[PDB]
Amino acid sequence: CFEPPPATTTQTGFRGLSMGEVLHPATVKAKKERDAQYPPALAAVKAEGPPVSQVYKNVKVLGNLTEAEFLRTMTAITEWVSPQEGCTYCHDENNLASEAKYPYVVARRMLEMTRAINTNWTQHVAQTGVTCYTCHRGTPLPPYVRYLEPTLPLNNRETPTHVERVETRSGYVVRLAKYTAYSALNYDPFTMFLANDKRQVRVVPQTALPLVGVSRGKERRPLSDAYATFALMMSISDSLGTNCTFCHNAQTFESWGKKSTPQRAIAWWGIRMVRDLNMNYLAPLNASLPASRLGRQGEAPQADCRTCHQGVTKPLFGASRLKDYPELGPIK
C-alpha cells in the first residue's frame, strides 16, 4: 500500500510554491543499478591503414573509419543490441557483406537515425547523446516501445496476462490506464501526439476574454483536447519518473518565462525529436520487418519518452559515450 520514509525532495520553484521532485530512495537505487549495466567504452584503437570504404565491400555509413576503428564499432553494436545472439544476428557467417538478414538493413538505418539524433537534436540530447544501448539495453527488441494501440506490459520482456493481451477487448481500459499513470483518462497520448505532428498539444487560451470567432459552437476545440493533453502529461511524467512541477509552475501551465523550468523547454524539443524519429526513421521500417514484429495494423514498433528514459529524468542518469564513439555523432 505505502512507501516507508524518508523521501528525497528537491526544489524547482521559489520557496513556498511546493515545486520539486519527490523520490523514494529504494526506487532510485533500483533504477541506478539497472542503468549501471551500461557496458563501459571499449578501449581506444589507433587509426591505421586505409578507410574501410576501400577495404570492405558494403560499407555505406561508416566508410571513413579505419579497420580497427570500424571493428571496434561492430563490437560495441553487438554488446549494445545483440550480446546474447552475437555477430551472426545481423550477418551471414560466410559473407559479412550480405544484407540477407533483416537486422542488417535495420541496423544500417538505426546507424543513420542514431547519428541524426546526436547531430540534429542536440537541443534535446546535448553533449550526453545516445547510443544503441540507450534504447535497446542489450536486446534486439527494445523493452519500451509503442504500437498504434496501447499494449501491456510496458516492458515487453515480461509475459502478458490473458487480459493484458491486446486481443482481449475486456482489458483495453486497463491497457490505457497504465499508459497514463493509472488515470481513467480515455485518450491514447501516443497515437494522438507522438506518432506524428498532426495535433497541437497546447489547449489553453492566451487571452483573458474569449476571442469572437473561435469561441462559439463548432469554432471551438472540444473539451476532449484538454483531457488528451492532460493524458499526455500524465504519461510524460510517468515516463521520466517525475511530477508536473519538474517543468511547470501549476499557477499557469500555459505560461513560459518564470513559470517554467528549463526542463520544460528541453521536453518541448523532445516532443519534436520523437515525432521526427517515428515519422522518418521508425515507422517506415514496417517494410523491412517480419510480420511478427508488426502490430495489428502492420505498424512497426515506435518510440516514446520511455523508450530512452525508462523512468529517469535523464536516460541512464546522464551516462554518455559520445566522446568514446565519435562515429555515432555529432557529424560535421
Binding site: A184, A208, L209, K258, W269
Partner: protein, 323 residues
C-alpha cells in the same frame, strides 16, 4: 462529562406517531421497525416511507439513467463480469469527444450520455416536487426546496447550461467515478486555473464556512443539551436558558451573537451560497472569461514570484524553431 451528547444511555420505546398531512396519508408504505444500535446515536425508528407520485417518477427516471450508464459501462469491458468489477471506478459514459457544436451527437459518441443526462434531470425535478410538496402537505415552509433548487441549478449549469452557452456538448460532466473526477482538471486546465476564478473562491469560502458553522452550531447545542437546547423550536418561541447561554458564549467570545433562530438562517444562507456562487462562476466561464489566471493578471490581482531555476523562453517563439 455529559454522556448524553455522545450517545443515548437509556433508550425509550413507545407507540409510533404519525402526523397527518393534507394528502397522501395512505401512500405511506412499510411497517416501522427499531434498531437498537442506531438508537444509540440517533432515533431508533426506521420507516415507514411516503411513496407519492413524484417519488415514483423520480425512481422511474433515475433507474433509467442508471441503467443507460451501467450498460454503456459494461460495453466498455466487452461485458466481462469480472473485469467490470475490477475496472468499475475507471469506467464511464462520456459526452461527445468530437466537436459537433450543439448538434445531437451520435449514440456511439455522446448520444447515450445526453440521454442519461435527460433522465437524471427529470429524476431531479421529480424529487424536487417531492421535497417541496411534502413540506406544504405537512404545513411547513419551503426552505429546504429552495436550497435544493440551488443545488439542482448548479448541476444543470455544469451538465447542460454551460455547454449550451458556449455551444458544445463536449464540455459536459462524464458519468462515472474516476471520469467525473477527471473532468474537473480538464475543465480547470481549459479555463486557465480555477483557483483564479473568484466564484470558485466564493463557493469555497462558503463551503468552508459550512464546516465552521456546523461544527460550531453542533458543538454549541451539545454544550447546552443539559438545558434542553436540542428542542430548538420551543427555544425560538420561548427563549430558555439554553439559548441564553449559547448566545452569551459566542457574544463573549467574538463580540456579537445570533439567536437560536437566526443561526439557522446563517447556516441555510451559507449552504445556499456554496451553490449560487458556483453557478455564477460556471455561467461566466467560457461565455465571458477564457482564462481565469490571465483575467486576474489583467486586473492586477495575480501574485508573481522570482525565478528559482532560470526563466525559460517559449522555444516555439525562437527564430527557426520547428512547429
Amino acid at each position: 462529562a455529559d454522556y448524553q451528547t455522545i450517545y443515548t444511555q437509556i433508550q425509550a420505546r413507545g407507540p409510533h406517531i404519525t402526523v397527518s398531512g393534507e394528502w397522501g396519508d395512505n401512500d405511506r408504505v412499510g411497517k416501522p421497525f427499531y434498531s437498537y444500535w442506531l438508537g444509540k446515536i440517533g432515533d431508533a425508528q426506521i420507516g415507514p416511507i411516503y411513496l407519492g407520485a413524484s417519488g415514483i417518477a423520480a425512481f422511474a427516471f433515475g433507474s433509467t439513467a442508471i441503467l443507460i450508464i451501467l450498460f454503456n459501462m459494461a460495453a466498455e469491458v466487452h461485458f466481462d463480469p469480472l473485469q467490470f468489477f475490477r475496472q468499475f471506478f475507471w469506467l464511464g459514459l462520456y459526452p461527445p469527444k468530437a466537436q459537433y457544436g450543439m448538434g445531437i451527437p451520435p449514440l456511439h459518441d455522446g448520444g447515450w450520455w445526453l440521454m442519461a443526462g435527460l433522465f437524471m434531470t427529470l429524476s431531479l425535478g421529480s424529487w424536487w416536487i417531492r421535497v417541496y410538496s411534502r413540506a406544504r402537505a405537512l404545513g411547513l415552509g419551503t426552505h429546504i426546496a429552495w436550497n435544493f433548487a440551488a443545488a439542482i441549478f448548479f448541476v444543470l449549469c455544469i451538465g447542460c447550461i454551460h455547454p449550451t452557452l458556449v455551444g458544445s456538448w463536449s464540455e459536459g460532466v462524464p458519468f462515472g467515478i474516476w471520469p467525473h473526477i477527471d473532468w474537473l482538471t480538464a475543465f480547470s486546465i481549459r479555463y486557465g486555473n480555477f483557483y483564479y476564478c473568484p466564484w470558485h473562491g466564493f463557493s469555497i469560502g462558503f463551503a468552508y464556512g459550512c464546516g465552521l458553522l456546523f461544527a460550531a452550531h453542533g458543538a454549541t447545542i451539545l454544550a447546552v443539551a443539559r438545558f434542553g437546547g436540542d428542542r430548538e423550536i420551543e427555544q425560538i418561541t420561548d427563549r430558555g436558558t439554553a439559548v441564553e447561554r449559547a448566545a452569551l458564549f459566542w457574544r463573549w467570545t467574538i463580540g456579537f451573537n445570533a439567536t437560536i433562530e437566526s443561526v439557522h438562517r446563517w447556516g441555510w444562507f451559507f449552504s445556499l451560497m456554496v451553490m449560487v456562487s458556483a453557478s455564477v462562476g460556471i455561467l461566466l466561464t467560457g461565455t465571458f472569461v477564457d482564462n481565469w489566471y490571465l483575467w486576474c493578471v489583467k486586473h492586477g490581482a495575480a501574485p508573481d514570484y522570482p525565478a528559482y531555476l532560470p526563466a525559460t523562453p517559449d522555444p516555439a517563439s525562437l527564430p527557426g524553431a520547428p512547429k
